[PDB]
Design a protein around this ligand. Structure first.
Ligand SMILES: CSc1nc(-c2c(C)cccc2C)nc(N2CCNCC2)n1
Lengths: 453, 167
């Protein structure tokens, strides 16, 4: 039993009670550490920099989700307060080795981790970085110098700011460099899928937890706080709209059958590549009111492709049951569909209290924050691995600059798409009209199987 | 085989729409919600002494995926068109949600309900009379709910099941 100073002098000395810290029945799966359910900010900071053992999971979780219950400037103050330990012989030499030195090292680990993985707090508050550099400068002694130097190297790096050969790029009617002829039917359907998988893979990888924690993509400053997520969602939306537009603007039935068939071939390749974002871009285009109603077009579609579309659609049925099952079964590289994560993070934050009350005292609900960090961690596990596919700068640029809406607002474009659907395939009993062909080039697909070894 | 009602929540984002379904499913006196499990969106209820299962789709958070609304709406028989009583833009947006639902279902008579959600203690900008009037012009019920007290949540959902049953 070790003697710690009075809570009147050192706030983190106060003993544990139901009024300041509570736990879950389970223990850390691989570490045997108890799981904190809720506690006061002091008790959470005490356990972040605990003397008996290091708690990397709790540190990793905390620094991701603390901004709801504590400001960066307030966290720094708390960890500086924790480091500056007063004393309360045998007891005084033991306390120094078993309490002060371990706690001081744990505060420096927090600092190091914060700076390494959440430098945005410092980019957005230069005085926060001022106080952090100052504190680090005051740190002295052997054992600390090693960490103080490593932290100083990270700060300055943050201020400064791998496989075998990939497959051969595929070409169909459009030739390399002839960007003016690039379209859905002229580019090779394998390369449309690959180049879109490459854009969508980079977009997915760029989303950071700072854009998700606190459900900030749904708030008034979402354009400021969640820019990479929003670009990602907008590419996906642009691609769905382009697929719908390609379909309904192809008024000739035989050419429109060629268009739906080519989109299904692209979907097949997205399924091969595990680009589930791309799979849903296609599924969403097909379930849209302008596309879903085109029964004369679907009548002429080969059964192989119908079945391909049926399976892709079924990944979404029953609250994404099969999608979830399929994502767990595959291994990277893949491009997950982000929408599920966004709904689960939102509903976790909105469906659980920020605070629990025990014996009339407010405890920060940390388990709510852990649950969010589990989802942000799940998103990060698929951001590590890249695709072994070559970029084609012209095809890339063609998809980056797609603008099916043009200068029209959503409603105006959405109605244009639907009124086009009604024009090309009128509501029964109206007879099916015939429309002239618009494609000079041949409609036969080259297939989804590569041409060269 | 008991009857299963496939319900869809549609409404503006950023205004606490998720509270409606969360509060429904949350066994009152339990505030430990987990959206990742099956029981989080399914609930066995007894409406007018006829037991049924309610499957609720709430895509709260995916509003930027504007081209996925048709995919999602297409899965439902009934719809709760939700707006916040402190946000006039979320109220003004109902006319288009209804227009899309009608267009997705190829019907002018879709089992549908209008829900006015009191998501916080910010000021009311949408008077009940405006909403009752809007709901009347469309020919659908109007239910007001509280996100804190759980008042009106059962009524909103049970009224929709009745609209489907009486269709
Ligand atoms: C590939 S042939 C096809 N595909 C689909 C379809 C499927 C199977 C899933 C999602 C969206 C759509 C449009 N639906 C239909 N039908 C729509 C309903 N009427 C019969 C055709 N045909």
């Amino acid at each position: 039993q070790m003697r710690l100073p009075s809570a009147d002098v050192y706030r983190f000395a106060e003993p544990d009670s139901e009024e300041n810290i509570i736990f879950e029945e389970n223990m850390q799966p691989k570490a045997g550490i108890p799981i904190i359910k809720a506690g006061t900010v002091i008790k959470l900071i005490e356990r972040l920099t605990y003397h008996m053992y290091a708690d990397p999971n709790f540190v990793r979780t905390f620094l991701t989700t603390y901004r709801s219950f504590c400001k960066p400037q307030e966290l720094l103050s708390l960890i500086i307060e924790r480091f500056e330990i007063p004393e309360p012989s045998a007891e005084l030499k033991r306390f120094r080795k078993e309490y002060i030195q371990p706690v001081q090292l744990r505060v420096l680990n927090v600092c190091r981790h914060w700076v390494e993985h959440h430098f945005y707090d410092f980019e957005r508050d230069a005085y926060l970085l001022q106080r952090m550099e100052e504190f680090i400068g005051t740190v002295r002694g052997k054992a600390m110098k090693k960490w103080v130097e490593s932290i100083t190297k990270i700060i300055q790096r943050k201020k400064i700011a791998f496989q075998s050969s990939p497959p051969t790029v595929e070409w169909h009617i459009s030739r390399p460099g002839h960007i003016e002829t690039f379209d859905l039917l002229t580019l090779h359907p394998i390369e449309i899928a690959r180049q879109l998988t490459l854009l969508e893979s980079d977009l997915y990888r760029a989303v950071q937890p700072s854009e998700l924690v606190g459900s900030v993509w749904t708030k008034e400053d979402k354009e400021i706080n969640s820019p990479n997520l929003l670009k990602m969602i907008r590419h996906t939306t642009n691609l769905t709209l382009w697929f719908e537009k390609c379909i309904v603007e192809t008024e000739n039935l035989e050419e429109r059958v060629a268009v739906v068939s080519r989109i299904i071939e692209i979907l097949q390749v997205f399924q091969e590549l595990n680009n589930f974002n791309g799979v849903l871009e296609v599924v969403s285009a097909m379930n849209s009111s302008p596309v879903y109603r085109l029964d004369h077009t679907f009548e002429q579609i080969p059964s192989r492709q119908k079945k391909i579309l049926e399976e892709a659609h079924e990944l979404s049925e029953d609250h994404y049951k099969k999608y979830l099952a399929k994502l767990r079964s595959i291994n990277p590289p893949c491009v997950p569909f982000f929408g599920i994560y966004l709904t689960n993070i939102l509903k976790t934050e909105e469906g659980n209290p920020e605070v629990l009350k025990r014996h009339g005292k407010e405890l920060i609900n940390f388990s709510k924050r852990r649950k969010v960090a589990e989802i942000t961690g799940e998103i990060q596990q698929y951001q590590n691995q890249p695709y072994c596919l070559r970029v084609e700068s012209d095809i890339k640029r063609f998809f980056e600059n797609l603008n099916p809406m043009g200068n029209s607002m959503e409603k105006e474009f959405t109605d244009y798409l639907f009124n086009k659907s009604l024009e090309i395939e009128p509501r029964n009993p109206k007879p099916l009209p015939r429309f002239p062909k618009k494609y000079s080039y041949p409609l036969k697909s080259p297939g989804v199987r590569p041409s060269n070894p | 085989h008991m009857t299963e009602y496939k319900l869809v929540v549609v409404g503006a984002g950023g205004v606490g729409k998720s509270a409606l379904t969360i509060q429904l499913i949350q066994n009152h006196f339990v505030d430990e919600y987990d959206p990742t499990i099956e029981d989080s969106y399914r609930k066995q209820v007894v409406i007018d002494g006829e037991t049924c299962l309610l499957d609720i789709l709430d895509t709260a958070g995916q509003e930027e995926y504007s081209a996925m609304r048709d995919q999602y709406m297409r899965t439902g028989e009934g719809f709760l068109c939700v707006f916040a009583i402190n946000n006039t833009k979320s109220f003004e947006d109902i006319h288009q949600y209804r227009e899309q639902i009608k267009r997705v279902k190829d019907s002018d008579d879709v089992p549908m309900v209008l829900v006015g959600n009191k998501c916080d203690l910010a000021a009311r900008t949408v008077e009940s009379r405006q909403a009752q009037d809007l709901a009347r012009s469309y020919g659908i019920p109007y239910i007001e709910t509280s996100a804190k007290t759980r008042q009106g949540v059962e009524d909103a959902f049970y009224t929709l099941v009745r609209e489907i049953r009486q269709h």
